[PDB]
Design a protein around this ligand. Sequence first.
Ligand SMILES: *C(=O)CCCC[C@@H]1SC[C@@H]2NC(=O)N[C@@H]21
Ligand SMILES: *C(=O)CCCC[C@@H]1SC[C@@H]2NC(=O)N[C@@H]21
Ligand SMILES: *C(=O)CCCC[C@@H]1SC[C@@H]2NC(=O)N[C@@H]21
Lengths: 184, 88, 510, 510, 256
Amino acid sequence: SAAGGDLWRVPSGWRVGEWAPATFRLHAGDRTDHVYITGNPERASAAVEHGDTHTVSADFTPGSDTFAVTLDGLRTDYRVAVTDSQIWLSGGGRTWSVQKVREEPVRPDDAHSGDAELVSPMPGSVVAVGVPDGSDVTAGTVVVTVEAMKMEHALTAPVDGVAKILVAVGDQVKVGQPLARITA
Amino acid sequence: SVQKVREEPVRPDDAHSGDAELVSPMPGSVVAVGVPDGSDVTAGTVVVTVEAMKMEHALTAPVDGVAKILVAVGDQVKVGQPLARITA
Amino acid sequence: HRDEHLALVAELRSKLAAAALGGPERARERHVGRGKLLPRDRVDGLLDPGSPFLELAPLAAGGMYDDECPGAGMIAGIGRVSGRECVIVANDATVKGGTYYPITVKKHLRAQEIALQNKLPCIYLVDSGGAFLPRQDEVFPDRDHFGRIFYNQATMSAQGIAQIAAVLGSCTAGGAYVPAMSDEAVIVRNQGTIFLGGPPLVKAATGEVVTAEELGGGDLHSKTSGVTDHLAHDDRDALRIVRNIVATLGPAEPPPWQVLPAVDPIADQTELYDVVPVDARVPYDVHEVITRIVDGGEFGEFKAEYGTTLVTGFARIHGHPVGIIANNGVLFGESAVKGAHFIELCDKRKTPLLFLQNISGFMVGRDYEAGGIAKHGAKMVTAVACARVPKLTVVIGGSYGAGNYSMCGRAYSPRFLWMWPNARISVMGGEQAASVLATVRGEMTDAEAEEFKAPIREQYEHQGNPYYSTARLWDDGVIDPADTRTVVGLALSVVGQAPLEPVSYGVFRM
Amino acid sequence: HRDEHLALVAELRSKLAAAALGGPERARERHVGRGKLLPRDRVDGLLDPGSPFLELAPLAAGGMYDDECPGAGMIAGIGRVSGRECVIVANDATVKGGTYYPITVKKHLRAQEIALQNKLPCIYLVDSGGAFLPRQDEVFPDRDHFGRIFYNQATMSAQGIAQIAAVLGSCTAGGAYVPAMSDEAVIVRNQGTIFLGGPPLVKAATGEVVTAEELGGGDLHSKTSGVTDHLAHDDRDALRIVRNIVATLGPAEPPPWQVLPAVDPIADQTELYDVVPVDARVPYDVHEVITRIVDGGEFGEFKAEYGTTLVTGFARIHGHPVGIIANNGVLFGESAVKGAHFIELCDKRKTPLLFLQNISGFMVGRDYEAGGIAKHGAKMVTAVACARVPKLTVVIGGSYGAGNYSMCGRAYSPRFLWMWPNARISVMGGEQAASVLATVRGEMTDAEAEEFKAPIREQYEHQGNPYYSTARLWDDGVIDPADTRTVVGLALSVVGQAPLEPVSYGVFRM
Amino acid sequence: PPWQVLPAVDPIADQTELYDVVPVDARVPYDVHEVITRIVDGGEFGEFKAEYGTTLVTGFARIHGHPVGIIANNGVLFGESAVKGAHFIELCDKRKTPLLFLQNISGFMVGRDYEAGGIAKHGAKMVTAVACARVPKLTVVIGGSYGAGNYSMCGRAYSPRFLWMWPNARISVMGGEQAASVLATVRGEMTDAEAEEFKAPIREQYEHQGNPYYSTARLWDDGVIDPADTRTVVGLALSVVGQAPLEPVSYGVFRM
Ligand SMILES: *C(=O)CCCC[C@@H]1SC[C@@H]2NC(=O)N[C@@H]21
Ligand SMILES: *C(=O)CCCC[C@@H]1SC[C@@H]2NC(=O)N[C@@H]21
Ligand SMILES: *C(=O)CCCC[C@@H]1SC[C@@H]2NC(=O)N[C@@H]21
């Protein structure tokens, strides 16, 4: 409705070949799934991930508090309210909210994503070590302090983990020199 | 209900307004005549077919009336030559 | 005529579905197994939700290269990203590792030509193994070979047409300039690799052994070399970053012309299957096409009673004004004079031109040459070549010889050109060629004449076929006839985004 | 190195002499026996007395089409007519009746591109039997196929670049637009003929029998149709009339830079044979070339101590200022940064650029990619593509891969590009290709290694050869090295005749 | 305005949180992202080259719906930081996006390997980009503003459309401790009680002349502002500077 018939704004998914389903990833309760909708609000089909394929018709009125869905021929009239992030629906004797959620990353993290490395921001010398080598620390913990140009660069552990310290007080250090590694 | 209607034309159309003259779209030759000369015809009836440039131009009567045929099969025809005339 | 059109559109849609898959299934499995999005899912994931996507030449290189290179190994087209229409060019890494074949270069250059002419931001999703070395002389060195891609990036960047790259896989040799020449480059960590010379060359030249991650991995370029501007965790994070970049470009220009509210056409567009013969030898009235594609069926014909083998008039399509020029028979001198006058009107009124080609050629004979049909044709060609308004061309039937030139064929730079599946394009029609060559060889028996004509008909049918045309990028796609209104409607919104030049004509041979 | 250059130049001059004859001697005899001038005598008869003539691609289509199409059936080049440099395009009616082969189209379009870029009047001496129908799909319909000739005529005419035709023989089908699209057209009485459809088509379509003089002879067009503007008694009268037309165009624009009196070079230019190795594997100092081609030997080198594998500096050639950019080894990042800065200086000083290519490529290895050599190369490519001054390129040695792009190869639209006879051009050098592919194939016996490498070497030697290049219009000609100074000196006077655009660059990847 | 203005979005933080995250003592390092994410609309900040030249932070945001390219010091300037800044300014110039400079700059990295690396040439490229940029420029001095770092970050000589100081800022050809240390190094060896007596007048000079009220008294800036008003002041200024049309893009020769 908001597209106002402007072809580039209408969510038709038009293609020269097979049209692309309008795709929503939705979270409600303990269920997160895609809904794929093809067609137009007057006559559409919707398929749900881990679910079935249903006929859909959707009767949206701008600024209305009510919205109607005919699902496999069963018309239900919902009270609807929407925030930046949640859709609240009530109808058919039940009430719920649904969140639109981001896609999962196609590549999951390696456990290295829990690890971090501290590097000297400046050339200078290590003036204090705040943590014993190979010890558990929290992301609030100052691990190594470098002095350069009369500035104390106190470097804070970015993660909770086992901190291993690579330098001793009085060591000269270069830019980007690893001073500690902190591991999950 | 009230309808807003378009203004009436200031001249009535002359009796010829229902008549049509069918002219050859191309130079070529007549390959069929579809209706007997002087018959009644109805719109969309094929009246004359001209072959030109190795294509067949079948010309329909656009209106019902007496169809008069002005050419015979095998006649060569120029562009815009009247092949038939339909009289309301 | 409906069943013949349905059979042709079924063949079209089958070919489109086959090309859309990309490479062999084992290549798709190896691509996804490394945690990548498939190239078409990369494109779809870049678009705004439910955006249309006007794919450029999906059947490029079809029937070429033993069909080993579906879509020429590339996905290209226009889609809405962050509220702007952008040209997206994505290497299909599943087709031969994204190797550039000669048609892959041609398709990339055509996508950049569309972006330059319409002022569209360019997004390059880069994942290519380099040039197809057995045909390197067709991939390199000429003016419209691979080196021209970067010439296009630089000069478009000079005009402020944003050039954005995301490096999603390999990027080697001259291809390393696709990221490095872009205004803003994204690279995926532990996937994207950029180098002017890769591990095999480093080994052959220096004896050093390196992996493609040590030589030019994403960490190296994002932290140390500065060749890249954003480090993405994965393909989805890269597409998200590209969307955020495009959100900084600001809006497109408003059209030069006034756009009204779109009015629905008076007919279901599959009625076009009823009115257009597949056999080009069967005449029909092209008004039956026009009144079905235009808004509300409203069509104001110019010079309706004069030069009647050419139909010219003003309409709207999706609220955009359009001047339609459509063939309705052989071109006469009167028809070309009519067309030139109409184009001058459209130029002054700033109205886009739509050319519906179904042209056998000009009228032949001594009285027509004496009448100066050649100079009336030249006046129409001058008007077409010099017209400053956007031109769109749909080839709905024949497109032969000098009639192709008068009707704004590919040489005249229409912003887009598409073929219907029944179209044919050739220096002359196949039956005309067979007839003229038979007349030159002289008297023959009917069987001797048929045996002489059959090879000529076969040549012109094979070369003039619309899939032969589209495989070579002579057009931007074969389209379903019933989609014509939508394709033009999408294009009319694109072509309004460039400002008009002033009116300027060559000398009309008066 | 002298004897190797002498052997290569002797081969060049033998090929040029063979191509200059045009068609077979029986065809030349039939041409002259009808009282015509030979096409090359038509061109020579058009020029001012003793004018030089800078022929475009005289060995086009060499080794193609079974060598049945010498010069691609066309003579094209720049000569002085009535005190102005004009682009002359003449159909060689002795070669296959002047049929347009695909390279004939490409050569015609290149001549029009030279005329557009340098604002040169175009003279078309028309005498052509039409398209080569067996390859009509390479002659028609694409953007750079035969229809583009008329688009060029129209748009050049819109810019006031005079388009002049003389119809000296047949002119058929779409070729009828060459005269009809001209601003002013001459036709020779009783042999020039113009028609959109010839006697064979008139017979096949209508059964009427006509001669080519009855249908569209010179009397008909000059008295009745008005397709032509002057009736010439013979070829020499036609050339006289064309000279009178050109005398009405007024003068060329003065150069945008200051031209000083030319100072002689300090050496005989055949000394270039002594200093340049034919074998591209042999290093030499390119200053030995530069100091020999420039006026007085004066060369002001810029950043002489930095990036020393690229030589950049200011000189004069025939009094015109030039910024010379010349390869002197492998390109480093420092070299590309140097080149980009020098190009910015030339752009602001309005000084035309001369590129002397002998480039293997960029320096390879992990420390160079980490140093961002691709980013520095991209800065040089941006400067080359965006430079507003005229660019000239001479390929004096290798021209391989991305080094071709950094050095203003054909994709970057240098106003002219020429090859020396020892040059090579390919996506990589033949030895590099053979080495990299052998390294990928792995360990093999030397007798097996040579058997594997020989086909690769043969491919890159065959495709990279400068006659293979020039046959396809990848360059504007192979030139004798000792002619380099003259060729550049002539071109510098041509390229000054167009006004400069304003300075504008794409985003430099700093 | 020549750019697109969107509906303004509130910042994610109370602006007096700026008092927590910025040290008054310029010798104490802090991450300038703590400032940026508090002043921009919705906290949204698209950083450009986040992993490279990390002592300069550059990125796109909105302030009161106006687009801004923020350029902020985050340490000493390196050559990498200056080429980053120049590239980002070229992007903002083509995108017609106004530039906001947040100065806290001691200067460029010193030493033989940096001069050999051409740090002066990279600084010159950033200075060229700043001087030639055709978009409006706004400058807030949030900390130190010393020497050639002032010039590289669009100080008063570069005609920022407005320039303001925070009350903790300092501005002089050197910092006071740099001047005192360099002059004591030229004095050579001296007793600590003699070194402090030598340094005290130099510190006093650079503290007196570098103070923000000494600056504003002489119109070297358009005002000392409360840090918590920075978002409002820039927002007001962003509505002003959109009222002039842009000149075309044009740069001097970049010393590549
Ligand atoms: C039989 O094929 C004769 C040709 C018929 C088609 C025509 S004639 C007129 C048009 N001009 C041309 O060159 N071909 C077209
Ligand atoms: C032997 O041929 C090893 C290959 C040498 C190729 C050289 S290396 C450096 C340049 N870069 C390139 O691509 N070719 C050149
Ligand atoms: C201590 O008093 C000396 C401080 C000044 C030197 C440092 S070096 C790096 C910064 N750049 C500059 O000019 N001064 C700062």
